[PDB]
Design an enzyme around this catalytic site. Structure first.
Site, PDB file in Angstrom:
ATOM      1  N   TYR A 113       0.819  -1.203   0.000  1.00 25.13           N
ATOM      2  CA  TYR A 113       0.000   0.000   0.000  1.00 25.13           C
ATOM      3  C   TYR A 113       0.863   1.266   0.000  1.00 25.13           C
ATOM      4  O   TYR A 113       1.084   1.871   1.059  1.00 25.13           O
ATOM      5  CB  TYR A 113      -0.885   0.010   1.254  1.00 25.13           C
ATOM      6  CG  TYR A 113      -2.038  -0.984   1.313  1.00 25.13           C
ATOM      7  CD1 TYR A 113      -2.464  -1.690   0.200  1.00 25.13           C
ATOM      8  CD2 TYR A 113      -2.725  -1.184   2.506  1.00 25.13           C
ATOM      9  CE1 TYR A 113      -3.531  -2.578   0.269  1.00 25.13           C
ATOM     10  CE2 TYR A 113      -3.804  -2.069   2.586  1.00 25.13           C
ATOM     11  CZ  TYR A 113      -4.197  -2.762   1.457  1.00 25.13           C
ATOM     12  OH  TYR A 113      -5.257  -3.635   1.510  1.00 25.13           O
TER      13      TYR A 113
ATOM     14  N   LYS B 262      -1.560  -8.469  -1.704  1.00 27.72           N
ATOM     15  CA  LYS B 262      -2.851  -7.810  -1.668  1.00 27.72           C
ATOM     16  C   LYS B 262      -2.589  -6.344  -2.024  1.00 27.72           C
ATOM     17  O   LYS B 262      -1.757  -5.698  -1.398  1.00 27.72           O
ATOM     18  CB  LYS B 262      -3.444  -7.966  -0.269  1.00 27.72           C
ATOM     19  CG  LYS B 262      -4.814  -7.337  -0.072  1.00 27.72           C
ATOM     20  CD  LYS B 262      -5.226  -7.413   1.408  1.00 27.72           C
ATOM     21  CE  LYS B 262      -6.554  -6.721   1.647  1.00 27.72           C
ATOM     22  NZ  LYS B 262      -6.911  -6.553   3.097  1.00 27.72           N
TER      23      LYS B 262
END
Lengths: 250, 250, 250, 250, 252
Positions: free
Chosen positions: A144, A175
């Site tokens: 992220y 992810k």
């Protein structure tokens, strides 16, 4: 080959749905007000089992007090709060060795590329990666980008960068955030190479249809599947919608 | 003598060409748009082998998932992103011991002399150097003065300082930026003493010829050769140009 | 008694001249332009031998690649660059145990009392001191107050403070800056007590006679001798001047 | 019970006088100009013995070069300089295990409660305390609130806070500043509980009578005694005044 | 199951009162002026015992010099002062292994979620949690959001966040601030799940009746009980008020 172990456990049908539930630390319990049962980890495990999902993601404290072996576990090793205001940083509150003893089949770790503290996480990820290999647990990296020069986190070039960094640092799965369309997201999937990509579910969408559409394009882009939290358990029809997601993904 | 081991493996013809490919983390996948095959590490290995180059540079994740033993490997131990805005720092995401297990014949590490964090990289380099001796793996230092009083990175005096710092800290080989002419670059080569110097390729030049002239000046200055990334794999005629580089250098 | 060991090896004639050559990292190769042979560590070792000096000071990389056992070695463990702009700090790039294996008869370490980072160096010096005792290698401290309230590093009270701090922290010998006159310098020598004091040579003086007068003052103040770099090897008559220094000191 | 061991060694007469001599690092040798013999640790040792004092406080370097077993030794483990400008911090330059080998009967450590770095010293004190118990050496804490909200270090409430913090963190004895009167100081003594309190002597008073009146008030307040430096060895009649202090305290 | 061990030792009657006494480092001795006997840890131990309380909280130095085994001990491992002005941080001055040797039945550790240094305490808590499991000592977390975006420490959403964070990080029991009413506090208790919640007593209330009412609401919210310091030992009638608290918590 830890990617292959990951796929065997978490993607036996060729695609994957992971029910994410680290939100109690990351966002706090305001997330649970829409559907109050969601505050109970036992309700979450039941949801995962009844919808036929591949895994759950818990922090160590939830795993220790509630995990019952009924669904494969990814132990999320690090966590931060939204109360925090500095340059983004999230440090491990659990070791890989402890994750193994809590019944984990994989470990999870968030990095924030671009943060003024990106180095602190890369340094710690190095130790976690080494332990993951030693204990034969796949490492799933939440990639992220945040802080530094990052302005838009879902911009195509940022998400592709996120995917590549996870591959380069040794992720066995990852992810990342969705770009909002399959064409740009497929570039992120491509640069991830042999490492499978799970889409982060994001904030609860206005309609259920909006989320099925996001998930449709994620799969078209060649991703392994989704790691979804709010878009399932924030809904009062959580189980029904979860089974519709299962129908679509598998 | 680890310099001699380095020369035996990576410079058997008396000069060296290393294909650098740590750019996935350092710059991100925008580097790969010009020639999209460059995003595939399998393509990079094929390219190195077919051009008869001496080695490749990978981060740990690319080495783990793709390295096949076909070309000697330098495992680049540290990495940072361009998303980052602080004083320049790049920490190890991998140990020397792990590099050994991934099939590396040498390890790489970047320092940024002058950075507000120069001490953090010198501290870590100390441990890596000690391990490199212990595992008998040559240490290749990327010496890139940046931050602090560094206003111009290719200035003659900055490149010479870079080269000398690498020697003083224990580099067995080094990679530094070109000054733009053979006379000034030869001063950098001289102050490096017994430690061989590889030129960093830099941004893709306007023409192929421009890069060949740089290369003809680097060799004239007495450098061992080049560690090149973009000026090979960013070109759609990558293999053809790579073979022309081999002709010139060897 | 490590002071006694230091004196036996580096001051067998009752006084000491050490040829310092850590300048490649501390200042960079601009120091070597005046007399280009000074860039070659082999020339430095020949110069130290031919002038009959007591020792040389090298960083680990120079020791590893060039040290031949011909003159006693002080291995300078820490180093910083002039490119660096923060509060003064210099961290170890080498351990005492590695210094022993490289052939050192003593180790050296710079502290900057007054720096915002004074604590980082005191903390690290504690470990080095403990290892110096364990490996029976004298510890030579370069005591250079800098940062904080320090303005002129050669003020009498600052140099005396430097000398006392070295004694208090466990130095077996020390290197400090000259005050510019024997009376004030002798106060620094006195507060150092049983620990011998070497004068740091400083920038190349306008004339040879000026430096020789400084040395005489140093000897009249009761110091053990000099640790000199630039005022020998920056000169094109380096060997001739070095032999005049030997005549004066011995 | 390490307090009892402390009292047995350093307070055999029921009260204690400790001759403090860590000033060489803390303040530097300007402290020694008033009475130049004070710069010689051998003189300090003789002064302690001839006045019949209970102990001396030395940093590790003084202990290693000068300590002769003639008076019980408290090895002061940490030290900082007045040249330093940051938030107050003083780190250990010596371990408890080394203190033991240097002949110490106790170890000393300064904390600065309120400092922006208070945590760094509490973290280190934890390790030192654990070692002190392991080696059976009493821990004497210099508790000097400084930085943060502290503006009057001798204020009754600050000195009482200093005393209580030392008790809470595990001190076996403590050294704190005098409030200037016996009533307020006796509150600090009371909150220290079973842990004996030594008054820090402070800057040389205008008259010998001024200091004797503070010592009188410290004894009246129930303190164990004094840890005095400057008010003894900064005086040219040091021995005479020391024997008057002994008369008063014992 | 360390929560069960905590409940067996500190909550044998089904509810819990812990007498907290880490204030000497956290606030300093100004806290002790109202009732000067409170500065004596012996008076404290007598007080807990005579009131029939379940435990005391001491820092390591008080435990080493005064703890006598007479009431179960929670060894508070970290501490900071109010003299400090930076972003909130409190580091361990004691290890779990040392706590065990000092006679502790549990260990306590404060976190300040939201602090610029939240990561330093989470990092250290990880090691302490691992050692608590190894030595079989329940870990009690003081969860006090402070710094960063936190502007009201007793706001319902902040207290609930505090409670959930303690659960997520591995607390076997927790101590959090009261929201001021039973409805909002019961949300904090609910999100804490299987981990029991103790109310932090807070500053001495204007009347004894105000504090009782806060305790009533804490119990109604489903909490295990209270960790109280000032509202007992800052009062000149400490013992009498302590016994009234016992009546209400174990009884009411």
């Amino acid at each position: 080959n830890l990617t292959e172990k990951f796929l065997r456990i978490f993607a036996r049908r060729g695609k994957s749905i992971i029910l994410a539930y680290d939100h109690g630390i990351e966002h706090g319990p305001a997330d649970f007000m829409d559907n109050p049962d969601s505050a109970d980890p036992e309700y979450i495990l039941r949801l995962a089992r009844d919808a036929g999902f591949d895994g759950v993601v818990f922090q160590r404290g939830i795993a220790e007090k509630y995990y019952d072996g009924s669904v494969p576990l990814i132990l999320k090793l690090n966590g931060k709060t939204t109360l925090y205001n500095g340059e983004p940083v999230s440090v491990a509150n659990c070791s890989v060795e402890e994750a193994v003893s809590l019944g984990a089949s994989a470990v999870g770790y968030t990095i924030y590329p671009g943060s003024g503290f990106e180095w602190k996480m890369f340094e710690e990820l190095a130790r976690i990666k080494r332990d993951a290999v030693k204990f034969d647990l796949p490492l799933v990296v939440w990639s992220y980008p945040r802080g530094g020069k990052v302005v838009n986190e879902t911009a195509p070039e940022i998400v592709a960068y996120a995917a590549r960094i996870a591959l380069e640092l040794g992720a066995d799965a990852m992810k990342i955030k969705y770009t909002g369309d399959p064409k740009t997201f497929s570039w992120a999937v491509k640069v991830a190479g042999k490492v499978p990509v799970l889409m982060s579910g994001g904030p609860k969408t206005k309609t259920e249809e909006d989320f099925l559409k996001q998930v449709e394009g994620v799969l078209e882009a060649g991703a392994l599947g989704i790691a979804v939290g709010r878009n399932v358990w924030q809904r009062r029809d959580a189980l029904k919608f979860a089974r519709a997601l299962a129908e679509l993904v598998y």
